[PDB]
Amino acid sequence: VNQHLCGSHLVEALYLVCGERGFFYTP
Amino acid sequence: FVNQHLCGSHLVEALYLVCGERGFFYTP
Amino acid sequence: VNQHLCGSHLVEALYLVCGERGFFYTPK
Amino acid sequence: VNQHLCGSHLVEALYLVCGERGFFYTPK
Amino acid sequence: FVNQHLCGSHLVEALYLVCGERGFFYTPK
Amino acid sequence: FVNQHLCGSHLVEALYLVCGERGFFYTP
Amino acid sequence: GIVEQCCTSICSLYQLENYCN
Amino acid sequence: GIVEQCCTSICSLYQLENYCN
Amino acid sequence: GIVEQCCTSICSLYQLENYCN
Amino acid sequence: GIVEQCCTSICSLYQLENYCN
Amino acid sequence: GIVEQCCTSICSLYQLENYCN
Amino acid sequence: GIVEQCCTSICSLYQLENYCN
Ligand SMILES: [Cl-]
Ligand SMILES: [Cl-]
Ligand SMILES: [Zn+2]
Ligand SMILES: [Zn+2]
């Protein structure tokens, strides 16, 4: 389950970092 | 306030869960 | 420890998935 | 959607607070 | 105020990722 | 590795709720 | 879009699902 | 319920603990 | 229990729904 | 403080960085 | 510190309170 | 992917930004 947990925190950080720009998440 | 910003944080977590192996593309 | 952290994401997933029914969290 | 968002934080909090006892969560 | 409590939880999350190994001391008041 | 960075994220969230108005000096 | 639809009023897993890839 | 008790004024640890099994 | 089934391998939404009330 | 600044308007990484140690 | 202590084994709330100001 | 990249070792916010739109 490690990878799945990491991705969850990774989207939260992209959301913060990327702002108005958004981001494509594509495992 | 910053209600949208806070909501959006939760929405992305929800897409991450719902969309699964598929991923998703976020933009406001 | 990995399981304790996983446990926190599970109850967030339950919260989203179960909607108006809700859920009873019992760990063991 | 303030109640939904607040509810997500409360299940995260119950998880920490209740530990292996669990909790029931029903949004009524 | 719960609105402030909720916003703080996100703020502590942000500062964790932004501050890296420097750390932070979260003060609301 | 990344596991510590993930745990630390959960710890700050826990210390925010546990410590209340006292706060906490997070220093990695 | 999402923000205006899902942050003004609640979206279930059902209407979040189409916003996927 | 907990939404009504805890989503306007902040619930303490003690108050939160009332909701555990 | 959920911890054993879902914190070892990834649970799908269908699998999570089983633990709903 | 951080609340007045960043709970009323969205703080950028740079504004938030101002509250690091 | 906290990491060394609370990311090896699970800390209880009372243990986590050790790290409050 | 970001996954292979940032779940194997820790990406900073500078590294993360490379993945924005
Ligand atoms: Cl985690
Ligand atoms: Cl929130
Ligand atoms: Zn986590
Ligand atoms: Zn929130």
What does the alpha-carbon distance between residue J5 and residue K18 come to, in Å, rounded to a whole number? 30
Residue pair K13/F18 in contact by the 8 Å Cβ criterion? yes
d(CA G3, CA B9): 11
Task: State the CB neighbour count (10 A cutoff) for residue F23.
Answer: 17
Determine the residue type at K8: T
Chain A: list its partners (3+ Cβ pairs within 8 Å): B, C, E, F, I, J, L
Question: What is the rounded CA–CA span in Å between residue E29 and residue E10?
Answer: 16
L2 Cβ contact list (under 8 Å, min separation 6): A10, A14, A25, A26, L11, L19
Residues of chain I positioned with their CB less than 8 A from the CB of C27: 1-3
F25's enclosing H/E stretch is strand F25-26
Q: Are D27 and E23 in contact (CB under 8 A)?
A: no
How far is D17 from chain K, CA to nearest CA, in Å?
7
Contacts for L21 with CB less than 8 Å, ≥ 6 apart: A18, A21, A22, A23, A24, B27
Amino acid residing at I7: C
What is the Å distance from ligand 4's center to A11 Cα? 15
Secondary structure (3-state) at C22: coil
Nearest to D8 by CA among A6, A5, C11, C18: C11
User: What residue ranges in chain H does DSSP mark as E strands?
Assistant: none
Work out the number of other CB atoms within 10 angstroms of the CB of residue E25.
Answer: 15
- K6-to-A1, A2, K9 alpha-carbon distances in Å: 20, 18, 5
For residue G8, give the nearest of A21, B7, H4, A15 by alpha carbon: B7
Can you tell me whether residue I14 is helix, strand or coil?
Answer: helix
Chain-chain contact of I21 with C26 (C-beta, under 8 angstroms)? no
Cα angle E16, J3, K18; round to 5: 50
Best CA proximity match to F7, nearest among C10, A16, C1, L12: C1
| Amino acid type, K2 | I
Evaluated on CA atoms A26, B5, B11, B17, the torsion sign reads: positive
Determination technique for this entry = X-ray
The residues of A whose Cβ lies within 8 A of any Cβ of C are 1-2, 5, 8
Distance CA(E28)–CA(F6), nearest Å, equals 24
Q: Which residues 6+ apart lie within 8 Å of H1 measured at CB?
A: D26, D27, D28
- The sign of the torsion formed by the CA atoms of F14, B14, J19, F4 equals positive
Q: Which chains touch C (3 or more CB pairs under 8 A)?
A: A, B, D, F, G, I, K
Question: Is residue L18 less than 8 Å (CB to CB) from chain E?
Answer: no
Residue in C21, C22, C27 nearest the CB of D22: C27
Helix runs in chain C, H state only: 2-18
Q: Which residue has the tokens 């504004």?
A: J15
Closest CA to I7 of C8, C3, K10: C3
Task: Looking at chain E, list the stretches that DSSP marks H as alpha helix, in order from N- to C-terminal side.
Answer: 2-19
Contact E27, F23 (CB under 8 A): yes
Per domain, the residue ranges of chain D are 1-28
